[PDB]
Amino acid sequence: FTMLQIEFITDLGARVTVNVEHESRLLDVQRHYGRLGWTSGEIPSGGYQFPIENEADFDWSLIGARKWELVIHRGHAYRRRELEAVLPAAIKYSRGAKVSDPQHVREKADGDIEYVSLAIFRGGKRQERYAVP
Amino acid sequence: TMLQIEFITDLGARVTVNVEHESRLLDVQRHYGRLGWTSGEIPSGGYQFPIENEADFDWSLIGARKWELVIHRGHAYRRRELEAVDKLPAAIKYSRGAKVSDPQHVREKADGDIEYVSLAIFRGGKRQERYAVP
Amino acid sequence: MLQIEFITDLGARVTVNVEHESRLLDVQRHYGRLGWTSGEIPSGGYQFPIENEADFDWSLIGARKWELVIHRGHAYRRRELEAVDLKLPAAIKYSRGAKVSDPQHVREKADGDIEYVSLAIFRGGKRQERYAVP
Amino acid sequence: MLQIEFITDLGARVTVNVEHESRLLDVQRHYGRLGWTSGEIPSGGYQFPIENEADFDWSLIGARKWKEELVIHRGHAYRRRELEAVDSRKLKLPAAIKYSRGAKVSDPQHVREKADGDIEYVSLAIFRGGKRQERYAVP
Amino acid sequence: FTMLQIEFITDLGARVTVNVEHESRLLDVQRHYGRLGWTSGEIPSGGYQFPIENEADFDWSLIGARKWKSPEGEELVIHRGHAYRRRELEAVDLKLPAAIKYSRGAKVSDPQHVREKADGDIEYVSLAIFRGGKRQERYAVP
Amino acid sequence: FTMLQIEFITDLGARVTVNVEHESRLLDVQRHYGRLGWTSGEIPSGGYQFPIENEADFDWSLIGARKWKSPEGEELVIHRGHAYRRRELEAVDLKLPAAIKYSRGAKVSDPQHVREKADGDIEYVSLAIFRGGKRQERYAVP
Amino acid sequence: MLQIEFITDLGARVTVNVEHESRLLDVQRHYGRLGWTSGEIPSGGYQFPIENEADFDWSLIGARKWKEELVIHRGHAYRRRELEAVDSRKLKLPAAIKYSRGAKVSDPQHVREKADGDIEYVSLAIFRGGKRQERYAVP
Amino acid sequence: FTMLQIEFITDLGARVTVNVEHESRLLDVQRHYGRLGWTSGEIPSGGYQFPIENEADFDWSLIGARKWELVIHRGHAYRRRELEAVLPAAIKYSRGAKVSDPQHVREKADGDIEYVSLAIFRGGKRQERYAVP
Amino acid sequence: MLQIEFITDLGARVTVNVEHESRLLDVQRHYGRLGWTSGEIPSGGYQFPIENEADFDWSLIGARKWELVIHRGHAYRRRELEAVDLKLPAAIKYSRGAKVSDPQHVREKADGDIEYVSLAIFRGGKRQERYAVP
Amino acid sequence: TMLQIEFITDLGARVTVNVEHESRLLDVQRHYGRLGWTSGEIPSGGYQFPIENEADFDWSLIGARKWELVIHRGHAYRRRELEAVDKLPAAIKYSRGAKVSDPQHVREKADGDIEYVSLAIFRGGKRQERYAVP
DNA sequence: TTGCGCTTGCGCTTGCGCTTGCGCTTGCGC
DNA sequence: TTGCGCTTGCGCTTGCGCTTGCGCTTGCGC
Ligand SMILES: [Ca+2]
Ligand SMILES: [Ca+2]
Ligand SMILES: [Ca+2]
Ligand SMILES: [Ca+2]
């Protein structure tokens, strides 16, 4: 009743369940396996929605991503995009769609270009839990 | 009689939790719901709840929170009062405009080339006390 | 020990432990009365023997009679499809008209630009006694 | 110990515990005889070795034979079709035995295979090539 | 709590969960049921992505696949009953790294989301692409 | 050189060109073959657009149409074998002028480009909408 | 004087001069007997009065009857179908006689009418309602 | 051999041919009937392409349109849009798509908005023929 | 006097005056030799009697033999379709594979994800002598 | 023997012109072509011309002009040299990137989610002297 | 690669969210 | 509204053009 299981997709695509003895260690477990490129769950449509004040020091390993100035996630490179307010300000991580990207993740934009979003940092209130330790 | 419930956390992670007894299920739903965790998918058309549950509905049951808007999985939904016609019954709907990222299967086409995405509709039915804020 | 995974009345994904396989159906009846369902409606609707239609236990699939069948917040209507002899067997179908929120894959195109969504069809087969209200 | 997840004859999602892996196929046969299935029909149908067709144990995929000899699976009827080898240098097609049915109005697009004469088929299984697996046959 | 579970789809398509005693043993369990043609999870869109230096001695049993040479001399990989051709894609410098791609032509039964439209009205379906990165030794045949 | 030609589609669908002696006689020629149900050109997308003050006494023969009241009391217009209902659309002030629209439900044989998706999964096909503008007297019944 | 534009039996776009409008239908019959057509099949098929069906002059649309009694038009065969009136207060359907064929692989989507059983039909003409037009009948 | 016919769609949608005795009067004939709202031919996909130096004094009656600050054409209102160079400078006339507009004329742009173009004024060299007399 | 409208080898739309109807076909032959065509290829291709295939005058439709048929810059291949007796008449078809520039409405879907574009089919009917090379 | 040719003018107007004799047709095509008038449509895939006509092709024949680009109906097309492969024949293609306004039926899908619109391809065939600049 | 299965009367409603420089490749399976 | 018609072996290629504040409505035909 304090125990928890989390289901990951590994670096090799495998569906693996990890047992967490203590609930409160959940984020540590996500960080641990995230550093190995394991992910849990799916990218929400439109990308993860995070508070804008979380962007500067976001722990990318939480979603199994890493910095490289790019963000690599499940073998894809995402570019950082600064969207000045005009519309609230936002910082978006996205990439150009690939021929293999299915329709439902493609976002049509100017010039017949399509984007695929990993995350957008905008609004909300900072959650210290999301930052690098 | 132990139960398990599967959640999607605020970070999207798929996590399973144990529950001692079925009578505690809703309490566990509210606890994790308050952190923005959700269990299951928004059904097509949105959740269908009894209209007499709308005024005091415990939104944490589905991982949602009031803000006069409902926030659910990073999205804001507006309250829409749909007056009965006599034939359509009265209804209170929570829905948002479609975003470029919303997949086709959740988009409801409306007048004026506007598409809506539904979170919930409170309509008809019989009030369930357990759905209200405690 | 078996485990059965339900979608609850609130859409939550909950797993129930069942001590004895002989109880499996009793457990589905029990929670089905609360409107919990397990698994998905098969494309075309569930397929049951026609000799099970008159006394079918709808709680087995989380539905209830109301003269309509209510399943996951939708009302389905009873449809007597007479046999023909160009050669069609008798059948009793439960289906509703498609809503704007119904996704393409559940819609069945019909005469007059109407689309139906199917819950169940009672056709042919051999009567299974356990499907009946005990 | 293994666990296998079934969809019952009532569509319910049920998990079974299997004490040792050597009993895996026994447990699959046992519940498959009850019409329970585990997993989805792979796109194109299951692919099995051609020399497994004659004595294939259909309960392994929760199907059964019925009398024309049809295979019943999830309340649908599938027909046995002999696809004769084509030995041209152009189109080489190996012998196959395919179990498929005409598409219904309720079948979604992703299971429909478009064919000659505006007909669509839905595949359950194809038996072709491969090498016989004894454990697939009826015991 | 040291233990893991891994979900496979067996050679008969069945959804079977296996217990693993220690995290360190994960890849070995995958190899074991992999040789039986069991797979875990889905082919990622665009195929698995592996380091180019891992291609020569990649352990295909990790993803439930096996190598097979055609009578015509084709280098093939068999995964879930489908054959994928080994394709050498030369570097271009338009900048494109060298790559080794495993893909097959689309079949009538392939859903749209796995089809990659290519030249001459051909559609390809990807299993894997070996490209860039740095070599992970654990990925190799032992 | 004072002369014009007008192309009609007859009641039998035939493509027939008619000579007109003077420009001034154009609308009268249209009325003449219009009464026979001959039409010229296509229904514009969204239906013809006419001034609202022209609706009450519009000469439907100008577009090869005719009025017809149903036994249920419906005000209808018949054009190329189809019936279009008269619909009164009240002003809204979201700003929308009052309008009188002639439209029918889509048929199975109607191509996609003429269908206007509306509420409740209904599709409408438009003949004409009377809305705004100022009255042209030539449009009226003489 | 009128001009009528035909599509010949060879598909050619040919314009004919007609000295006086009273001869219009005569000229339509004359070339229609040669299989020439003028204009397109209206969507849904031509719509003609029901009491014109029995003695309709098919050459008016460049069609002809052939022996089952079929109508041939642009090298396609159309079947006569009697659609019996439905007099319910719910669905009121007048008697009709429809000439239509099953859709071919070459028929584009805009002529295909989707029906029961995944069948598509292509319409040539429907005879229903209206009032008899004598000039439509065979002379 | 100096004669010319021009085919118009009238204000009532009718397909009418006008005989022009002298070729050189073609533009006068277009202006004359254009003032009555008659048009000849179709709007090219993407709108008519005119030289940017023709925009200030363009004779809208040439394409059967008129000013009203809007341009009315075949019963539709088009808005003038100034697109500062960044991309050459351009002046576009377009409107929001209507529910009745067929797919092939709709131009998807930001925010699920679709536009329908009448004309774009850009590049080229001024043609005095196109200006108001 | 008749008028016939051609699309020329340069795609130009040109109308030719024909003094006598009896000459109509001779005029189509004349310009067809220059690769001018009149009207459109009917959906499914032209339909001619099977007894006209062996000596068909291709210039009538602006085509020429080259063993292929060339029409408007495309090569079409001859296709002997044997009769069967489930019941198909004999037929000789002229068609080519679809190009990436071919629009959807001319494509005929076939086995192996191949699409064909049809020029003509010689099937049934009764031989029309005027269709032949004179 | 009088002919008529139908043009789309630089303003899009549909105009018909008379021609005294067929031998003057191309001269009339060039005259009006020089003003940007076109006759007929660009065929699907583009005009198909003989490769040995490319170097000195009279673009005014189709209402086009050189500028190293070809301008046609307000659009600019690039020359693309497609080397033979041995099996593909050599080819010189004039095509532009698709615009948001280009309808689907003219768009040719290529590598990299790029779509092309073709004006013309010079490939194979036999040189026609009358197609060259005089 | 295959020959083909179906049937039913219908449910609505709402104002709208936006942004980004783009990634390619392969021969093909009936 | 209707019962159903089919067949064929396949042709490729190219670097890319961009922009805009948005218009609604109707009950439905088999
Ligand atoms: Ca900190
Ligand atoms: Ca009993
Ligand atoms: Ca001036
Ligand atoms: Ca002869």
Put simply, the answer to whether J98 touches A114 (Cβ < 8 Å) is: no
| Dihedral angle of Cα B94, B97, B103, B109, to the nearest 10 degrees | 90
Strands (E), F1-142: 4-9, 15-20, 48-50, 66-69, 75-79, 82-89, 99-105, 116-117, 123-130
Which residue, I42, I53, I43, I39, is CA-closest to I6?
I39
Put residue C44 in one of left, alpha, beta given phi > 0 → left and psi -120 to 50 → alpha. left
Cβ neighbours of H110 in A, within 8 Å: 109-110
Does the CB of J63 have a partner CB in chain I at under 8 Å? no
Other CB atoms within 10 A of residue G67 CB? 5
Determine contact, residues A48/A119, Cβ cutoff 8 Å. Answer: yes
Least Cα separation, residue E74 to chain A (angstroms): 25
Question: How far does chain B reach from its first CA to its final CA, in angstroms?
Answer: 24
Residue with tokens 């749209």: E112
The DSSP line for J7-74 is: EE-TT--EEEEEES-GGGHHHHHHHHHTTT-B-S-PPTT-EEE-GGGSTTB-GGGGT-EE--EEEETT
Kindly give the pairing relationship between strand B108-109 and strand B115-122: antiparallel
The DSSP line for H51-81 is: -GGGSTTB-GGGGT-EE--EEEETTEEEEEE
Does the CB of J16 have a partner CB in chain H at under 8 Å? yes
Structure tokens at J25: 């047709």
Put simply, the answer to whether J16 touches H7 (Cβ < 8 Å) is: yes
* Residue C60, SS3 per DSSP: helix
Residue E30 DSSP symbol: H
- Residues F14, F19, F25, CA angle at the centre, nearest 5°? 115
- Maximum Cα interatomic distance, chain D, rounded to a whole number of Å: 51
Q: Of E17, E41, E126, which is closest to A13 when you measure between CB atoms?
A: E41
Reduce the secondary structure of A3-39 to three states and give it as a string: CEEEEEECCCCCEEEEEECCHHHHHHHHHHHHCCCCE
Angstrom distance (rounded) from CA J84 to CA E109: 35
Which residue, J122, J120, J118, is CA-closest to J108?
J118
Structure tokens at E66: 């096996």
Instruction: Break chain D down into helix, strand, coil percent, rounded to 5.
Output: 20, 40, 40
Structure tokens at H15: 């397909």
What amino acid is encoded at C23 in this protein? R
Least Cα separation, residue E110 to chain D (angstroms): 6
Residue with tokens 């220059």: I34
Which residue, F87, C73, F6, is CA-closest to B91?
C73
Please list every residue in chain J followed by a chain break, i.e. its C lies more than 2.5 Å from the next written N. Answer: 67, 86
Q: State the ligand closest to the CA atom of I129.
A: 4
Which residue, D26, D27, D33, is CA-closest to D62?
D33
Angstrom distance (rounded) from CA B8 to CA A129: 17
Q: State the ligand closest to the CA atom of C130.
A: 2
If you measure from the C-alpha of residue H56 to the centroid of ligand 3, how many angstroms do you get, rounded to a whole number? 11
Determine contact, residues G27/G19, Cβ cutoff 8 Å. Answer: no
Mutation target to probe the E interface, by most E beta carbons within 10 A, among A15, A101, A104, A106 is A15
The DSSP line for J94-132 is: EEEEPPTTS-GGG-EE-GGG-EEEEEEEE-SS---GGGB
Residue with tokens 């039915």: B125
C51 alpha-carbon distance from chain centroid: 15
Determine contact, residues G24/G18, Cβ cutoff 8 Å. Answer: yes
Question: How far does chain G reach from its first CA to its final CA, in angstroms?
Answer: 23
Angstrom distance (rounded) from CA B107 to CA E22: 45
Determine contact, residues D48/D136, Cβ cutoff 8 Å. Answer: yes
Angstrom distance (rounded) from CA E123 to CA B87: 50
Does the CB of G116 have a partner CB in chain C at under 8 Å? yes
For F25, residues 6+ apart whose C-beta sits below 8 A from its C-beta are: none
Count CA atoms within 13 Å of residue F113 on its CB side: 12
- Residues J42, J43, J45, CA angle at the centre, nearest 5°? 105
Angstrom distance (rounded) from CA A122 to CA A108: 20
Angstrom distance (rounded) from CA H68 to CA H79: 10
Nucleotides on strand L lying under 7 Å from protein C-beta: 1-30
Nearest nucleotide relative to H110: CA against C1': K18
* Residue I104, SS3 per DSSP: helix
Angstrom distance (rounded) from CA D134 to CA F69: 77
Angstrom distance (rounded) from CA H8 to CA H15: 6
Structure tokens at B46: 């949105």
Cβ neighbours of E79 in D, within 8 Å: none
Residue E45 DSSP symbol: T
Angstrom distance (rounded) from CA A6 to CA A33: 11
Determine contact, residues B47/B62, Cβ cutoff 8 Å. Answer: yes
Angstrom distance (rounded) from CA G25 to CA G14: 17
Angstrom distance (rounded) from CA I23 to CA F73: 57
Other CB atoms within 10 A of residue C122 CB? 24
- Residues D13, D14, D19, CA angle at the centre, nearest 5°? 150
Kindly give the pairing relationship between strand I2-7 and strand G13-18: antiparallel
Structural domain harbouring C132: 1-134
Which residue, I118, J61, J115, F50, is CA-closest to A114?
J115
Put simply, the answer to whether F41 touches H14 (Cβ < 8 Å) is: yes
Determine contact, residues G50/G128, Cβ cutoff 8 Å. Answer: yes
Which residue, H44, H6, H47, is CA-closest to J14?
H6
Other CB atoms within 10 A of residue E105 CB? 16
Angstrom distance (rounded) from CA J30 to CA B8: 69
Which residue, F108, F139, F140, is CA-closest to F125?
F108
Which residue, B109, B116, B66, B61, is CA-closest to B93?
B116
Angstrom distance (rounded) from CA J98 to CA A104: 23
- Maximum Cα interatomic distance, chain H, rounded to a whole number of Å: 53
Name the method of structure determination: X-ray
How many residues does the structure list for chain C? 134
Cβ neighbours of F108 in C, within 8 Å: 113
Structure tokens at J120: 């013309």
Least Cα separation, residue B45 to chain H (angstroms): 21
- Residues J74, J79, J81, CA angle at the centre, nearest 5°? 160
Partner residues linked to C56 by β-bridges? C132
Report CA(F120)–C1'(K11) in Å, whole number.
6
* Residue C126, SS3 per DSSP: coil
Angstrom distance (rounded) from CA F119 to CA F98: 19
| Dihedral angle of Cα D19, D21, D25, D26, to the nearest 10 degrees | -30
Angstrom distance (rounded) from CA I107 to CA I98: 6
Determine contact, residues H36/J66, Cβ cutoff 8 Å. Answer: no
Put simply, the answer to whether G110 touches F107 (Cβ < 8 Å) is: no
* Residue B131, SS3 per DSSP: helix
b or e along H11-41 (b: 16 or more beta carbons within 10 Å of the residue's beta carbon)? bbbbbbbbebeeeeebbebbbebbeebbbbb
If you measure from the C-alpha of residue I55 to the centroid of ligand 4, how many angstroms do you get, rounded to a whole number? 9
Put simply, the answer to whether D3 touches E16 (Cβ < 8 Å) is: yes
| Dihedral angle of Cα F32, F33, F36, F42, to the nearest 10 degrees | -130
Cβ neighbours of G115 in C, within 8 Å: 111
Domain count of chain A? 1
Nearest nucleotide relative to J90: CA against C1': L13
Angstrom distance (rounded) from CA A95 to CA A83: 15
Partner residues linked to B48 by β-bridges? B121
Instruction: Break chain H down into helix, strand, coil percent, rounded to 5.
Output: 20, 40, 45
b or e along I22-46 (b: 16 or more beta carbons within 10 Å of the residue's beta carbon)? eebbebbbebbeebbbbbebbbbbb
Determine contact, residues F51/F135, Cβ cutoff 8 Å. Answer: yes
Determine contact, residues G52/G137, Cβ cutoff 8 Å. Answer: yes
Angstrom distance (rounded) from CA E115 to CA A101: 10
- Residues J2, J6, J10, CA angle at the centre, nearest 5°? 135
Q: For residue B84, count CB atoms less than 10 angstroms from its CB and return exposed for 0-12, middle for 13-18, buried for 19 or more.
A: exposed
Structure tokens at E10: 């067996």
Determine contact, residues F103/F127, Cβ cutoff 8 Å. Answer: yes
Torsional sign, CA E108, E112, E118, E120: positive
For F64, residues 6+ apart whose C-beta sits below 8 A from its C-beta are: F8, F33, F34, F36, F37, F38, F39, F40, F79, F80
Q: State the ligand closest to the CA atom of C129.
A: 2
Provide φ and ψ at H25, rounded to 5°. -95, 0
Nearest nucleotide relative to D104: CA against C1': K5
Provide φ and ψ at I26, rounded to 5°. -65, -35
Angstrom distance (rounded) from CA A107 to CA B101: 6
* Residue A116, SS3 per DSSP: strand
Angstrom distance (rounded) from CA C102 to CA C115: 10
Partner residues linked to F123 by β-bridges? F117
I114 alpha-carbon distance from chain centroid: 21
Q: Of H5, H48, H105, which is closest to J12 when you measure between CB atoms?
A: H48
The DSSP line for E61-129 is: GGGT-EEEE-TT--EEEEETTEEEEEEEE--B---B--EEEEEEEPPTTS-GGG-EE-GGG-EEEEEEE
- Maximum Cα interatomic distance, chain C, rounded to a whole number of Å: 51
Does the CB of G59 have a partner CB in chain F at under 8 Å? no
Residue with tokens 């692919």: D47
Cβ neighbours of D123 in E, within 8 Å: 109
Provide φ and ψ at I114, rounded to 5°. -95, 140
If you measure from the C-alpha of residue B10 to the centroid of ligand 1, how many angstroms do you get, rounded to a whole number? 19
